[PDB]
Fold this sequence. Notes:
This is part of a larger assembly, with chains A, B, C and D.
Chain A: E1 3-5, H1 17-29, E2 89-93, E3 107-111, H2 117-129, E4 139-141
Parallel strand pairs in A: 2-3
Antiparallel strand pairs in A: 1-4
Chain B: E1 7-10, H1 16-28, E2 33-36, E3 42-44, H2 47-59, H3 77-81, H4 89-95, E4 98-100, E5 126-128, H5 129-136
Parallel strand pairs in B: 1-2, 2-4
Antiparallel strand pairs in B: 3-5
Helix pairs in contact in B: 1-4
Chain D: E1 13-21, H1 25-35, H2 40-52, H3 82-101, E2 110-122, E3 125-128, E4 132-135, E5 138-148
Antiparallel strand pairs in D: 1-5, 2-5, 3-4
Helix pairs in contact in D: 2-3
The structure holds chloride ion (CL) (7 copies), magnesium ion (12 copies), sodium ion (12 copies) and strontium ion (10 copies).
One chloride ion (CL) binds at residues 25-26, 118, 139 of chain D.
Chain A binds 2 RNA strands through helix 1 and helix 2.
Amino acid sequence: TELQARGLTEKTPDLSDEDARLLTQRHRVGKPQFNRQDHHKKKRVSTSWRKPRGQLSKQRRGIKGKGDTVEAGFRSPTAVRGKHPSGFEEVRVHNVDDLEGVDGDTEAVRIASKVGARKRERIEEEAEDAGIRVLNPTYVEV
Amino acid sequence: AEFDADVIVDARDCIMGRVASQVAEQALDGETVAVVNAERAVITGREEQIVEKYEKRVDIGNDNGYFYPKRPDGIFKRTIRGMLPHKKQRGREAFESVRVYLGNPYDEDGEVLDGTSLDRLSNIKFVTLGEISETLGANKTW
Amino acid sequence: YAGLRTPAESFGSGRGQAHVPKQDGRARRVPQAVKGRSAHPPKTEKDRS
Amino acid sequence: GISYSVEADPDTTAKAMLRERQMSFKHSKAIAREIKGKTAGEAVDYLEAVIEGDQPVPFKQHNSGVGHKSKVDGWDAGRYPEKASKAFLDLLENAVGNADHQGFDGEAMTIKHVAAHKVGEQQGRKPRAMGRASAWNSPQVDVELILEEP
RNA sequence: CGCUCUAAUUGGAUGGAAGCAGGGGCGAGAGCUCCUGUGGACCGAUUAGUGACGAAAAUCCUGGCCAUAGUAGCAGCGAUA
RNA sequence: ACCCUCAGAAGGGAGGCGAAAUAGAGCAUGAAAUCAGUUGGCGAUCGAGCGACAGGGCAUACAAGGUCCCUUGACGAAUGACCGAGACGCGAGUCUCCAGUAAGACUCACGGGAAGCCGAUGUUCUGUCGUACGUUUUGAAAAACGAGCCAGGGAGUGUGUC
Lengths: 142, 142, 49, 150
Ligand SMILES: [Cl-]
Ligand SMILES: [Cl-]
Ligand SMILES: [Cl-]
Ligand SMILES: [Cl-]
Ligand SMILES: [Cl-]
Ligand SMILES: [Cl-]
Ligand SMILES: [Cl-]
Ligand SMILES: [Mg+2]
Ligand SMILES: [Mg+2]
Ligand SMILES: [Mg+2]
Ligand SMILES: [Mg+2]
Ligand SMILES: [Mg+2]
Ligand SMILES: [Mg+2]
Ligand SMILES: [Mg+2]
Ligand SMILES: [Mg+2]
Ligand SMILES: [Mg+2]
Ligand SMILES: [Mg+2]
Ligand SMILES: [Mg+2]
Ligand SMILES: [Mg+2]
Ligand code: NA
Ligand code: NA
Ligand code: NA
Ligand code: NA
Ligand code: NA
Ligand code: NA
Ligand code: NA
Ligand code: NA
Ligand code: NA
Ligand code: NA
Ligand code: NA
Ligand code: NA
Ligand SMILES: [Sr+2]
Ligand SMILES: [Sr+2]
Ligand SMILES: [Sr+2]
Ligand SMILES: [Sr+2]
Ligand SMILES: [Sr+2]
Ligand SMILES: [Sr+2]
Ligand SMILES: [Sr+2]
Ligand SMILES: [Sr+2]
Ligand SMILES: [Sr+2]
Ligand SMILES: [Sr+2]
């Protein structure tokens, strides 16, 4: 009579204190949007980042208010860079054989979208038993 | 029409600019001020020159306009507005919570803000807003 | 010779027009013109061995 | 063409549509805007008042140069577009008709929805001086109407 | 980083591929990925190649479209109907 | 097909076919510019590179993010007191001790709380900064040049030789 997601939906990974600290840091510090200059002034200009190249470019010249320019100083911490906000390390999965070798204590799995409903079912049940959380679970009615 | 002023200042024999400066800060601190006896407020200097400066403000103008007050009424009020960012929400709020009056329409007796008093026994070169308004051509309603 | 089969000429300055070879008011030959030549296309003379 | 842009319960609603009508699209927005909410009947009596010149239609958006009309309320500009009004009468005729053929009380029904949509232009050309010709087109208008039991 | 097509290895799809729309997550970023809806047949990854491979600009090209605007014109001519 | 409407072989309505008519004739898909209708936010006393970064209002079905707030406590970098005591200075004020103490960003734990609630997204308000972009130029917001808007098109290629 209600919807419920398959798998270990609530499972949390177990991280070292340092990792847990850095993950937390990442989440607190965040970063600027880094959208292409004036993408908002012209519809023919996408939000996709491009280096300001104008000799006179205000942003390129680094004027406060014209937005930040992409620099290595903005990189996230090596130790957590690329983790799901949960803390897990994502694993792209296309079939069941892809679940083999995965550690559910550290990694969580994400089933490709192309994968059909039939194969997702198998992959979803086999993943649960191996104790692996599936980030994009199927919601059934129980 | 009734003005629940938290503070009533007595401008009589007081240096206009200095009174204006404090009533400005207070208004910005949420205080509701009422400057009384505006006509008896005083500005220091050589009357001839002073009046020359206020007459020019009356002569200035064009189609856009430079409406400048002649009544001691207000302004004094204008003097205060020039110490307030009256074009910003907060500024306009403060300004609109300040009123200047000819004589004293209150039962109470305004207080004399410190540092704003002119000692007539030690000064000969000063003027009265009323004297200025009269020269400017205002009808001495007060 | 693809895109080069036309006598299109440019009007030059004078009519608030960009100097682009036109024919029958149709721009095109030039590479930036629809139906124009390819600027640097595949070439037979190239040794692909 | 268009498709009804609003849901309509078949058991308490009647629909109607105009297709590719060559008439002012600008006048159509004005009229739609004006009659929406009224009663099929009221609407008709109204459009007739307009075609007759006794009731003006407020031109709030496409009003450049339009002279003011005293009878217009809350606004100044609006006019009396009889052609578009007539086309709307044909629409309401159709609407109320259907409504009736279904059991409802055509006239009593409320104009729940009614919007005009520029469906295209019938192109034309007009010779100009200096050996040049310019566009001289006709708007093509679609319009939807939905009546609903009061 | 992204694009085309080739090859070896290896995967996904009518239990719904690509695309598109809105939305969630990751990456300093190029960009990657998931969800939902639409869609109704194709689509990838890795490695080595291939190049008619990346646009905001050129009075750039073609197509489409808005404001202009219900505006100017539908009067002027010795033929005022 | 049938029926209803209509001046009507038009169109419209209802209806039938098909997995699909939002497959009904330039009839697979159906982007942007853009139009109508409508929703959220703002709005008829107020100021203009349209935003970036902060922080408040209001708005939010699910999914794909799940955090967030207050007591207290732990840790506690640079920095770093009040009060009190004593002693100087014409004075504003200062020194010495208390004391590198109390305090001190982040993070964590206990207990209590939030689900439009935290993130996020839309819009709007406040703060700070801010006169596009690309080019030409010693110097561009420029009263120097280019573009109405969007989509798609649009520029280091081949041979020979060194
Ligand atoms: Cl790096
Ligand atoms: Cl004036
Ligand atoms: Cl101001
Ligand atoms: Cl004196
Ligand atoms: Cl139109
Ligand atoms: Cl930390
Ligand atoms: Cl090069
Ligand atoms: Mg844009
Ligand atoms: Mg060609
Ligand atoms: Mg007019
Ligand atoms: Mg001729
Ligand atoms: Mg391989
Ligand atoms: Mg460019
Ligand atoms: Mg392109
Ligand atoms: Mg063009
Ligand atoms: Mg005009
Ligand atoms: Mg005659
Ligand atoms: Mg189609
Ligand atoms: Mg020069
Ligand atoms: Na003076
Ligand atoms: Na004046
Ligand atoms: Na030819
Ligand atoms: Na060859
Ligand atoms: Na108007
Ligand atoms: Na009126
Ligand atoms: Na009226
Ligand atoms: Na042009
Ligand atoms: Na907000
Ligand atoms: Na130039
Ligand atoms: Na410039
Ligand atoms: Na200039
Ligand atoms: Sr899918
Ligand atoms: Sr002060
Ligand atoms: Sr010339
Ligand atoms: Sr208008
Ligand atoms: Sr190219
Ligand atoms: Sr037009
Ligand atoms: Sr005539
Ligand atoms: Sr039907
Ligand atoms: Sr200004
Ligand atoms: Sr310490």
